[PDB]
């Protein structure tokens, strides 16, 4: 149970909820055909668009509760350690990131991390005290984007609609960069099926641990947009 609440740009904390579209609480989205899968059930929405230079290291921050109610980094914050799963980031080019609706956008995936050598993306999130990082590709066309960030908790993913999606979106303005557009985009809803192998999945191994029995973990959604 966690909430996406700030972005950092090369280490610079952009501000609590600045430029973020956020839910009212930490409850997961479980219906991949719901419009809530796009940016969550958004109830908090500002006019700010964050400046992100192409190539910048971008941080996104997750907290168990909003702001000071999160408490210190511990067993529940940023997320319980049982909530193993991937963490992803997508973008969608828009006209104005402060005013765009979220229906019918063309999303492409810019970062992902899953399971590797017994460690989940979530474990890195915990080690980095709630921050997850990616590099904004240097070749991407400048301008207005919505940035969707996602963590999927898989501790109950064995049953249909058991996967817990923690999601939000950030309003951004990419400066510098290049002229790349993704050749192939995906929709939300649409990109995910409730029976995808990285969504309907029992991650518990022979000794009852979240090791996916050592099998490859197939991150949901499209291939990465690359430079
Ligand atoms: Zn939880
Ligand atoms: Zn706590
Ligand atoms: Zn709690």
Swiss-Prot record:
O2 binds at residues 155, 164. Changing residue 204 to A/F/W: Leads to lower C4 oxidation and higher C1-oxidation. Cu(2+) binds at residues 1, 83, 166. GO terms for biological process: cellulose catabolic process. Binds 1 copper ion per subunit. It comes from the Eukaryota. One of its GO terms (molecular function) is monooxygenase activity. Its EC number is 1.14.99.56. GO terms for cellular component: extracellular region. Keywords: Carbohydrate metabolism, Cellulose degradation, Copper, Disulfide bond, Glycoprotein, Metal-binding, Monooxygenase, Oxidoreductase, Polysaccharide degradation, Secreted, Signal. It is an enzyme of class 1 (oxidoreductase). Its cofactor is Cu(2+). Glycans are attached at residue 173. Its main location: secreted. Disulfide bonds join 39-169, 139-227. Lignocellulose is the most abundant polymeric composite on Earth and is a recalcitrant but promising renewable substrate for industrial biotechnology applications. Together with cellobiose dehydrogenases (CDHs) an enzymatic system capable of oxidative cellulose cleavage is formed, which increases the efficiency of cellulases and put LPMOs at focus of biofuel research. Activity in inhibited by excessive amounts of H(2)O(2). It catalyses: [(1->4)-beta-D-glucosyl]n+m + reduced acceptor + O2 = 4-dehydro-beta-D-glucosyl-[(1->4)-beta-D-glucosyl]n-1 + [(1->4)-beta-D-glucosyl]m + acceptor + H2O. It is found in: Secreted. Induction: Expression is induced 85-fold during growth on Miscanthus. Lytic polysaccharide monooxygenase (LPMO) that depolymerizes crystalline and amorphous polysaccharides via the oxidation of scissile alpha- or beta-(1-4)-glycosidic bonds, yielding C4 oxidation products. Catalysis by LPMOs requires the reduction of the active-site copper from Cu(II) to Cu(I) by a reducing agent and H(2)O(2) or O(2) as a cosubstrate. Degrades various hemicelluloses, in particular xyloglucan. Active on tamarind xyloglucan and konjac glucomannan. Acts on the glucose backbone of xyloglucan, accepting various substitutions (xylose, galactose) in almost allpositions. Belongs to the polysaccharide monooxygenase AA9 family. Has a modular structure: an endo-beta-1,4-glucanase catalytic module at the N-terminus, a linker rich in serines and threonines, and a C-terminal carbohydrate-binding module (CBM). The CBM domain is essential for binding to and subsequent oxidative degradation of polysaccharide substrate. This is AA9 family lytic polysaccharide monooxygenase C.
């Amino acid at each position: 149970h966690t909430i996406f609440q700030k972005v950092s740009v090369n280490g610079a904390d952009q501000g609590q909820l600045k430029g973020i579209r956020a839910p009212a609480n930490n409850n997961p989205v479980t219906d991949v055909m719901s419009s809530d899968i796009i940016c969550n059930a958004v109830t908090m929405k500002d006019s700010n668009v964050l400046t992100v230079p192409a190539g910048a290291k971008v941080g996104h921050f997750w907290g168990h509760e909003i702001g000071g109610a999160a408490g210190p980094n511990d067993a529940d914050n940023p997320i319980a350690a049982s909530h193993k799963g991937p963490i992803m980031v997508y973008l969608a080019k828009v006209d104005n990131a402060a005013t765009t609706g979220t229906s019918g956008l063309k999303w492409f995936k810019v970062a992902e991390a899953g399971l590797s050598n017994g460690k989940w993306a979530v474990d890195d999130l915990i080690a980095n005290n709630g921050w997850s990082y990616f590099d904004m590709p240097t070749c991407i066309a400048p301008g207005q984007y919505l940035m969707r960030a996602e963590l999927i908790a898989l501790h109950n993913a064995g049953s249909q609609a058991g996967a817990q999606f923690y999601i939000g979106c950030a309003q951004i303005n990419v400066t510098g960069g290049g002229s790349a557009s993704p050749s192939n985009t995906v929709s939300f809803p649409g990109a995910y099926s409730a029976s995808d192998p990285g969504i309907l999945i029992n991650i518990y191994g022979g000794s009852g641990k979240t090791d996916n029995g050592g099998k490859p973990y197939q991150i949901p959604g499209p291939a990465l947009f690359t430079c």
